[PDB]
Amino acid sequence: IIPIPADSYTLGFIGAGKMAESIAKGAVRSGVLSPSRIKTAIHSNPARRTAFESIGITVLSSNDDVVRDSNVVVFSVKPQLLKDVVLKLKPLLTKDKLLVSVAAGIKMKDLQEWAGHERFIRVMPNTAATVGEAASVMSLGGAATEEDANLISQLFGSIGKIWKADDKYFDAITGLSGSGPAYIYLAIEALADGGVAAGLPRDLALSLASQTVLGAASMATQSGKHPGQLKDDVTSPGGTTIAGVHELEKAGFRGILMNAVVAAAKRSQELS
Amino acid sequence: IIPIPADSYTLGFIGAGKMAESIAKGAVRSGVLSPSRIKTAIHSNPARRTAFESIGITVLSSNDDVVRDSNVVVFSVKPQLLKDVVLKLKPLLTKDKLLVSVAAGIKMKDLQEWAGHERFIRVMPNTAATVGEAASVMSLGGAATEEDANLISQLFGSIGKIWKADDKYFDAITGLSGSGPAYIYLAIEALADGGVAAGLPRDLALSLASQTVLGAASMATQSGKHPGQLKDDVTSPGGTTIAGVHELEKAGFRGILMNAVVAAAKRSQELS
Amino acid sequence: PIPADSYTLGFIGAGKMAESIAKGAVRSGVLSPSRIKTAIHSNPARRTAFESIGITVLSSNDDVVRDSNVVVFSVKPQLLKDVVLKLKPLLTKDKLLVSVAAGIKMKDLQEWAGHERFIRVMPNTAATVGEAASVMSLGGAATEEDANLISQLFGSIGKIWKADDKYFDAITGLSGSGPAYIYLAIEALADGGVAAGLPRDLALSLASQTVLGAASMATQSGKHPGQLKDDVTSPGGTTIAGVHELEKAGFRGILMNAVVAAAKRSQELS
Amino acid sequence: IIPIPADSYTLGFIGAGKMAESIAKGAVRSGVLSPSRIKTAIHSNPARRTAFESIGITVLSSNDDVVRDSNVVVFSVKPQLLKDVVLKLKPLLTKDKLLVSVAAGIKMKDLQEWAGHERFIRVMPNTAATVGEAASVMSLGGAATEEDANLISQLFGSIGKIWKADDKYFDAITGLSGSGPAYIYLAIEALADGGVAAGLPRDLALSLASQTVLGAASMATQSGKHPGQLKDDVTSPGGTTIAGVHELEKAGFRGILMNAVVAAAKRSQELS
């Protein structure tokens, strides 16, 4: 358990997919890494090779070589393939290398058991990694150090925001930040459909809907205020906003969103 | 109707309130204007003086002096005060000066009638102007030129996005982009409440809820995809997301949001 | 100007609300009983109610008006117009007039009296225990000092704010009518406790005090109600389970509906 | 089992948190205790030291010292920490010291077992302790005396009202007076939103909502009347109040509150 060199470490991705590509691009963009400090290896699809090579990243010929050449190893394969991937690599997974999993639904207890050591960090990012606005949460294995956590905080900070939490919260996280973007995609479409129903052109309705949601969320993220207070700030007496708000409350809007999170969290738990 | 010099016009705010401050800051930040080209005047509250002076802007002693010194005049008082404010200034409202209203709910027909001429642009911004993410729409009076419009686009482009539309769409705009932020504040709170109901800490639930919404909206704004495509991208077969989405659909989530927009737009119309 | 420390107050309509205001003003020292007058109508039990507080009961409404710097109209609303018309010669501009009548607008008050030195107040039922929510509106000739005087008076029986007359239908639906919404809530909470196995007496005692406490927190804490709700909803706990039931059912929207309906009814009546 | 000296006993808090601070302040305010008769010890957060010292209370260096110096010991740590805290202190928990737990959801049977004796009182307060308007209930362990009960009644009388009940009622007490304040916070916000929907300014709507609720509860507390009679007193024929009440009854308002108490009480039982 030697500290990973914060400014010069090399990063390897096992599973050269979309999430790996997003993280790589983000980290290159933010200057946290350069392409020469990133490695991956393809599986069956040769189009993935091109994706990485075109951003300056070297694609090695096996998972084993990626691990050998890396200080930090990110496992970014589909969850149901992760166990075998880790077991095959296990002789190379020495405690001087920080391991990271972004696999949905795979618990730290299992990660540590497969790898045979506890210098492991789990991250649950979300789809908005692609635009640098992921909501990510990390949980630390028994031997991950504070400096390991800072390294991962800086890396994932390059594709959005990143918070820390106990591993036991990750089913609920999955139902909220993991699954939530679909709730808001529905909301955006519905708001646009509402605009069109009220007489607006469809291109404008959609443009407004998307930017309205973006603006409101940016207020919530930057203002330091409770969402109730933000709502209070915009509801003028007897005005349009409160008329719309009343329709939401008549229908139990808040309880519907709560239901969705809860159902999604419960599903996460059922899928293990 | 002399063209307003694009690179040298002076801007005046009538009503030195929150929205004026947001616009002024934005325009100074973007480099559209320098503080020396902006003027305003205080009403009763001397704290507003400080707000403007601290960004380098000169506070004159009356609304009349602001108008005299300005090529472009933005009316940013509360809507129910606007008529008397304009009537009092009318003699100074010569046709060489471009007039702009940001007042919610006040139609172009009335603006033009109060001012006595048609070189008037209406804008409807929203509350996210404070963080530079407003959704704004402008409509042009009968004598507003294409160059006048470009000037106003550039100015409102500095506090978010800005689109153009006929005045007859403004009730529906008001119900969607004007009132919509409250719908999303409710959504954010409810997502957080859902997280807590599924066992998350509050501080984390709320941070995730806000950043989830922000991220999803960023994906909608940048991806070029229809919201249904985005929803398809994240709903993996039999997974957590589609479980949550199904709960939303069982309850008619989309129709509830449509209802809110339609009701808000109908209220806008009823208020005039 | 009405002498702030020495004025005399008259009640026209010696009912419950007049009694509550009289007691509260006596208790706070804003008035003494010797500075308050009223007159009975038909019920002689009202005489004993006022006399037992040290207040003189005069023999007619006319005498009450003559002897008073400030005149509070505290008869039922449908009786107010005739009462004011009968007294109109005595309603001189040196006397401040006040109505606590539900649903009667300032425009009508001023028209019946023939002048504009008139203040309207909408209190509520909790005046009885010194916890009213009250709002005042000022007629066209009511002065700032007149307003202060009324604030002091209604500050003795609860809280008092100022608002334009045009808000009073909505006020009536919220603070006027709202107590009944809470009485339902209290009963329901108790019934819920009994349904979960609690003894009735204890269920009811807990319900009332839980509501009292929560409202005291909202009043004193300086926090938004959402923040207060956040403070008590621990992760996966009992509180968020209960809140989730409320939200599934659209609890908030139901209370909104009640306020809106009540306000609409106020407008329709008035 | 020596009686605790009613006028001179010393009180110790284990767990120097919010509830401990509320109880301390209430007891000082009412004159039941003086600050010199109260002791506590901090854990990790030194801001808690300042909170108690600023009330005149001595902060000792360990839990063990607090116990040694106290006749009455109040356990005010989070419930999931309580078992270990009591086990560690057990050698000092002699029968001459009255023990009290304010921990939510921890039964008398377990308390007695952990401490190794039955001179134990359980109290369930609620959040309004902060303003002296808690609804609290106590249950008595097998060796708690009448004089012990009077001592606790007096103590908790200083932060609200306090009743006695068998331990088997506590899941339902938790769902009603423990959780109930949230139900009322929703109600207060909803009433305010309703005011705004009916045309009121926000500040006034919220002020009125809060005081209306406070008033009505004071009437219920002081009047000696059944809530149905209080409702009958304010519902004039065909008037505004009955119009509002009818909307409540149409929607099954009473059943919804009953549902919330029941669900909360059931959750309490499930959490143990």
Ligand SMILES: NC(=O)c1ccc[n+]([C@@H]2O[C@H](COP(=O)([O-])OP(=O)(O)OC[C@H]3O[C@@H](n4cnc5c(N)ncnc54)[C@H](OP(=O)(O)O)[C@@H]3O)[C@@H](O)[C@H]2O)c1
């Ligand atoms: N995508 C998101 O937005 C998001 C959000 C949160 C979490 N995640 C998590 O991120 C992980 C990756 O998702 P993704 O969307 O990027 O998946 P993906 O695009 O399908 O990428 C997975 C890659 O792994 C490769 N692979 C399969 N077997 C392999 C092996 N034995 N060794 C090395 N590579 C192998 C696949 O290549 P072939 O196709 O050639 O077999 C594929 O390129 C998942 O566990 C997911 O739960 C994703």
Ligand SMILES: NC(=O)c1ccc[n+]([C@@H]2O[C@H](COP(=O)([O-])OP(=O)(O)OC[C@H]3O[C@@H](n4cnc5c(N)ncnc54)[C@H](OP(=O)(O)O)[C@@H]3O)[C@@H](O)[C@H]2O)c1
């Ligand atoms: N805020 C938003 O998010 C938003 C969004 C869309 C549209 N709008 C619109 O923008 C306008 C301004 O809103 P706002 O929130 O900025 O309001 P605000 O902050 O209250 O600003 C109003 C300002 O006008 C001043 N004022 C009052 N009477 C005046 C007079 N006769 N002459 C000059 N100034 C006077 C007020 O001063 P005193 O307080 O000192 O009297 C105050 O500084 C409104 O029409 C609103 O509909 C706002």
Ligand SMILES: NC(=O)c1ccc[n+]([C@@H]2O[C@H](COP(=O)([O-])OP(=O)(O)OC[C@H]3O[C@@H](n4cnc5c(N)ncnc54)[C@H](OP(=O)(O)O)[C@@H]3O)[C@@H](O)[C@H]2O)c1
């Ligand atoms: N009580 C509240 O909580 C509350 C809340 C808000 C507003 N208000 C308003 O306050 C007003 C009074 O209500 P209240 O509940 O006190 O009514 P109340 O108890 O019935 O008393 C009104 C009194 O007026 C008397 N009266 C009838 N005709 C009269 C006349 N011509 N001259 C003088 N007095 C006459 C009645 O006499 P008899 O005894 O002979 O019948 C009665 O004692 C109402 O307008 C109500 O809307 C009350």
Ligand SMILES: NC(=O)c1ccc[n+]([C@@H]2O[C@H](COP(=O)([O-])OP(=O)(O)OC[C@H]3O[C@@H](n4cnc5c(N)ncnc54)[C@H](OP(=O)(O)O)[C@@H]3O)[C@@H](O)[C@H]2O)c1
């Ligand atoms: N708050 C309420 O309204 C309310 C209502 C009813 C019941 N209760 C109950 O009252 C109890 C306390 O709640 P609370 O809100 O007051 O919690 P709190 O504010 O978090 O207080 C807990 C305190 O215990 C300390 N602590 C942790 N481990 C300790 C140990 N081993 N020895 C001594 N102290 C330790 C903590 O210190 P650090 O900060 O350093 O960790 C903290 O100061 C809970 O059991 C709760 O169920 C609370």
Ligand SMILES: [Cl-]
């Ligand atoms: Cl509005």
Ligand SMILES: [Cl-]
């Ligand atoms: Cl999914």
Ligand SMILES: [Cl-]
């Ligand atoms: Cl809880």
Ligand SMILES: [Cl-]
């Ligand atoms: Cl009524």
